[PDB]
């Protein structure tokens, strides 16, 4: 029942007052259950009937579907959670099974009516006040308010995590080898004792809790291999995710989308790529949990996509600190990369895929890097240590990339994996000019007002050219110009621009891009044999530059 | 131990709120140490455990002063400093010791522990909350809020300025020619004596401080006497191949932004035509006129460049080859206060993040010693990379403010 544990002081947001929203009448059969559900709740002191002095209220509803054969009382705290002070969500994420080590005996406890056990600050109670409507409208409102932590209120999770840490603090200090883990209302207890001596230890825990109000029901995972903890299955030697099943429906309400959004975020921790962005925007656009909302195209596409993701079966082996951590990375879809972290070959701990925007333009190696950087941080958050790295790329390749690249970068310890899609550099832009090669003194321009402007060179050989361009930026024509000088040119060239913009996009030796033109400029650059891009200041009497402008420039 | 003291009331700047940063993840080696350092610090009653109901947070982590020593907890109070009330006039220090930079030697002492006796205004305390990561988020974090002046803060030395002045008055009497400066948890001590005969005057200040109740560790040295400048230089293949007169006139075109006494003309002319870069053009007797005059204005100190205590300091770093780096510290663009080239890396120190880190620091201490303030950095690295390594090479007790960028062809315009 109600824990006689020390309650936390909770404040509202600075300046905001409590929630005073209006209750909307349900049905005479719904309403009667809501009262009966509330007379059972007032019987257990979870709640307390109030009066004509309390100026606050919160919307009460009744969900039609009975989960575990229970048609309960859903409350809408949406307003209160806005007025309810912030809290602090202590951790850096959810735990992950590959963190765990093999513990002989294991036991997972379920905290029954957990939130309902721990109590709420007697002051903040006037705020959680609600009201069950009346059947005979000749009779008034059945006003309540909570005494315990509500089920959807903002703080409840935060607080209860605290209430439980303090109650398990004693018990944790007395048997420093038995590991106890905590998340929502699932208690993981596991150690290296044998069944008897260990179950005594569980009994002792169950009792320690009971003395404090928390009640672990008989639904105890008494040592039988499939332990269900946090949407996973802890087997004797491996773990497997319990399959996530999203609801299929055509008529979604404010509430129903909400639950799913949650389930999605939950699922998003275990699996990647799962978005919630569009579905989310449906909740900002309308009120009242009952009223229906039609999905959009983006939102309905999302659902089919996550559900797609949520299809691939996930699993792994437990952690062994005696051994090294190895993480192997591979290339895939011209921007797709896969990695697997393991200790014993073929025995996977974590398996995933990294794919991300290396900027507007990108490089291949400069992609592997970020892949590495992201694996390290994930490892450090799971095993507190950096994994030894196996990278598909010759040693002197990386060497020749950081010796050149103006930006400082680094990859921790890594060994060479001789495997197919090897990452490497496609084209070495020369350092000094080539003797003999044709000297293309390029330029280009446009008009912001018309979107039309010129683009072409003026070689040393006397050659010339130009082209008229429609719907181009004063800049893209400058990139274009380099395109030309490259095509109409031998296996060796000495281009020369006035564009800082392009000088850079080229300098960074890109491999792919979002810009078609650039993409084209790449392919050519590879094709060629001895390129040389140089730079010289515009609007000055330099060289051929001085003359190529006139042809490309507007009114002179 | 805490002296019965009436707490000095501190407030956040107007309109602002306390920090709510987030905690970067830490290794096992590091977490452990923060845990030991915290249980004791907690028995000694310095910091107290706190609940969820405290919105705030700051990052904490564990560095390591020198080679194979004891872990020193470090707190990233950068965010709290910015929001914390600049103080009346009792500054972090005093009207900056103009000669701190000209001393034959300078030693740095971690005075930090000093703050551990004074109590901190009961109200301002929630704003110092910090949280300790737990490997694999097994345990809900260790949450702690200070009770005493915190070592990182700026309110600390601001407050304990009186006390420290007192503690030092004697050492100042006896030794008048010795210059001492305090930048937060640090005492900058510089004299014009021999090193062996410097390292004594220090230990003396050590023992004395030790007597008046300050437990200082051993010491760190610098000699702002050999500190030099790195200038803009012109090549040897002057006015030769076309290419050459191009890079030349390119470079000399930028430096106009600095000193406008330079001229392009008698060089852009040799550039006239549409000639192959590969051509050894004629170094005409009118170009040598422009270049020898261009050579000159370079070996010269800028005009109008003078420090202003009101604007922030900024620094830019350009990687430049084999264990070589360069940097610039200014307040207003192109108006240089200092240009230099940190270069000391090969083999074992051949790690990009390690080198940059160390450079950042040499630039930061150089600003304290010289202007008595930390510069805002413009870092030649991508945010994510640098953030997964700095702390593995950071040894200082302060953390400067940094921003991340992309170096254009500036690298060529400095080496």
Swiss-Prot record, chain A:
Impact when changing residue 65 to E: Strong decrease in RT binding affinity for all dNTP substrates and in catalytic efficiency. 100-fold decreased sensitivity to ddNTP inhibitors
Record-marked site positions (Essential for RT p66/p51 heterodimerization): 401, 414
Localization per Swiss-Prot or TrEMBL: Virion
Mutation effect (residue 441 to W): Virions contain primarily p51 RT
Record annotation: effect of changing residue 451 to R: In strain: Isolate PV22
Subunit structure: Heterodimer of p66 RT and p51 RT (RT p66/p51). Heterodimerization of RT is essential for DNA polymerase activity. The overall folding of the subdomains is similar in p66 RT and p51 RT but the spatial arrangements of the subdomains are dramatically different.
Protein name (Swiss-Prot/TrEMBL): Reverse transcriptase/ribonuclease H
Coverage span on the entire protein: 600 to 1155 of 1447
């Amino acid at each position: 029942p109600i824990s006689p544990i020390e309650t936390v002081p909770v404040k509202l947001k600075p300046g905001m007052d409590g929630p005073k929203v209006k209750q909307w009448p349900l049905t005479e059969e719904k309403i009667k259950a809501l009262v009966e559900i509330c007379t059972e709740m007032e019987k257990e002191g979870k709640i307390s009937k109030i009066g004509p002095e309390n100026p606050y209220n919160t919307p009460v509803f009744a969900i039609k579907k009975k989960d575990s054969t229970k048609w309960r009382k859903l409350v809408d705290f949406r307003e209160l959670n806005k007025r309810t002070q912030d809290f602090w969500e202590v951790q850096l994420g959810i735990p992950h099974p590959a963190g765990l080590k093999k513990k002989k005996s294991v036991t997972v406890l379920d905290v029954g009516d957990a939130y309902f056990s721990v109590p709420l600050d007697e002051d903040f109670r006037k705020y959680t006040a609600f009201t069950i409507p009346s059947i005979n409208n000749e009779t008034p409102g059945i006003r309540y308010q909570y005494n315990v932590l509500p089920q959807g209120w903002k703080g409840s999770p935060a607080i209860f995590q605290s209430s439980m840490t303090k109650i398990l603090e004693p018990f944790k200090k007395q048997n420093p080898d038995i590991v106890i883990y905590q998340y929502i209302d699932d208690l993981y207890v596991g150690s290296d004792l044998e069944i008897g001596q260990h179950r005594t230890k569980i009994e002792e825990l169950r009792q320690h809790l009971l003395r404090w109000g928390l009640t672990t029901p008989d639904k105890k995972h008494q040592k039988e291999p499939p332990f269900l903890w946090m949407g996973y299955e802890l087997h004797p030697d491996k773990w497997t995710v319990q399959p996530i099943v999203l609801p299929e429906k055509d008529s979604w309400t404010v509430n129903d989308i909400q639950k799913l959004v949650g389930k999605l975020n939950w699922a998003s921790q275990i699996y990647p790529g799962i978005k919630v962005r569009q579905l989310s925007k449906l909740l900002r656009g309308t009120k009242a949990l009952t009223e229906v909302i039609p999905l959009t195209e983006e939102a309905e596409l999302e659902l089919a996509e996550n559900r797609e993701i949520l299809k691939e079966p996930v699993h792994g082996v437990y952690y062994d600190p005696s051994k090294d951590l190895i993480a192997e990375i591979q290339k895939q879809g011209q921007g797709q990369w896969t990695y697997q972290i393991y200790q014993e070959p073929f025995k996977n701990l974590k398996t995933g895929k990294y794919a991300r925007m290396r900027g507007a333009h990108t490089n291949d190696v400069k992609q592997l890097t970020e892949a590495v950087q992201k694996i390290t941080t994930e490892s450090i958050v799971i095993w507190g240590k950096t994994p030894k790295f196996k990278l598909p790329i010759q040693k002197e390749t990386w060497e020749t990339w950081w010796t050149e690249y103006w930006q400082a970068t680094w990859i921790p310890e890594w060994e060479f994996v001789n495997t197919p899609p090897l990452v490497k550099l496609w084209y070495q832009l020369e350092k000094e000019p080539i003797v003999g090669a044709e000297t293309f003194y390029v330029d280009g321009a446009a008009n912001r007002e018309t979107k039309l402007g010129k683009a072409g060179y003026v070689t040393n050989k006397g050659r010339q050219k130009v082209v008229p361009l429609t719907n181009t930026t004063n800049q893209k024509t400058e990139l274009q110009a380099i395109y030309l000088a490259l095509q109409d040119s031998g296996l060796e060239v000495n281009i020369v621009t006035d564009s800082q913009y392009a000088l850079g996009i080229i300098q960074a030796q890109p491999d792919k891009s979002e810009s078609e033109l650039v993409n084209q400029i790449i392919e050519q650059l590879i094709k060629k044999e001895k390129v040389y891009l140089a730079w010289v200041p515009a609007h000055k009497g330099i060289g051929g530059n001085e003359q190529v402008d006139k042809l490309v420039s507007a009114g002179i | 131990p805490i002296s019965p003291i009436e707490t000095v009331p501190v407030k956040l700047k107007p309109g602002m709120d306390g920090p709510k940063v987030k905690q970067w993840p830490l290794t096992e080696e590091k977490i452990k140490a923060l845990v030991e350092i915290c249980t004791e610090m907690e028995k000694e009653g310095k910091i107290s455990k706190i609940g969820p109901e405290n919105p705030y947070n700051t990052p904490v982590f564990a560095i390591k002063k020198k080679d194979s020593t004891k872990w020193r907890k470090l707190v990233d109070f950068r965010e709290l400093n910015k929001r914390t009330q600049d103080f009346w006039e009792v500054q972090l220090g005093i009207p900056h010791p103009a000669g701190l930079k000209k001393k034959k030697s300078v030693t740095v002492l971690d005075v930090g522990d000093a703050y551990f006796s004074v109590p901190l205004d009961e109200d301002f305390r929630k704003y110092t909350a910090f949280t300790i990561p737990s490997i694999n988020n097994e345990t809900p974090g260790i949450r702690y809020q200070y009770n005493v002046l915190p070592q990182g803060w700026k309110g600390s030395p601001a407050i304990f300025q009186s006390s420290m002045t007192k503690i030092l008055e004697p050492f100042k009497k006896q030794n008048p020619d010795i210059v001492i400066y305090q930048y937060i948890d640090d005492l900058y001590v510089g004299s014009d004596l021999e090193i062996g005969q410097h390292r004594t005057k220090i230990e003396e200040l050590r023992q004395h401080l030790l007597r008046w109740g300050l437990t200082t560790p051993d010491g760190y040295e610098l000699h702002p006497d050999k500190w030099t400048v790195q200038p803009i230089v012109l090549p040897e293949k002057d006015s030769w191949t076309v290419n050459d007169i191009q890079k030349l006139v390119g470079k000399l075109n930028w430096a106009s932004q600095i000193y406008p006494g330079i001229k392009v003309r008698q060089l852009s002319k040799l550039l006239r035509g549409t000639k192959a870069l590969t051509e050894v053009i004629p170094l005409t007797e009118e170009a040598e006129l422009e270049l020898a005059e261009n050579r000159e204005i370079l070996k010269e100190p800028v005009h109008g460049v003078y420090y202003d205590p009101s604007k922030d300091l900024i620094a830019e770093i350009q990687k430049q080859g084999q264990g070589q780096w360069t940097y610039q510290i200014y307040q207003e663009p192109f108006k240089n206060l200092k240009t230099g080239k940190y270069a000391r890396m090969r083999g074992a120190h051949t790690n990009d993040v390690k080198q940059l880190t160390e450079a950042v620091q040499k630039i930061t201490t150089e600003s304290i010693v010289i202007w008595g303030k930390t510069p805002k950095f413009k870092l030649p690295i991508q945010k994510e990379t640098w953030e997964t390594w700095w702390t593995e090479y950071w040894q200082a007790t302060w953390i400067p403010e940094w921003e991340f960028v992309n170096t254009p062809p500036l690298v060529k315009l400095w080496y």
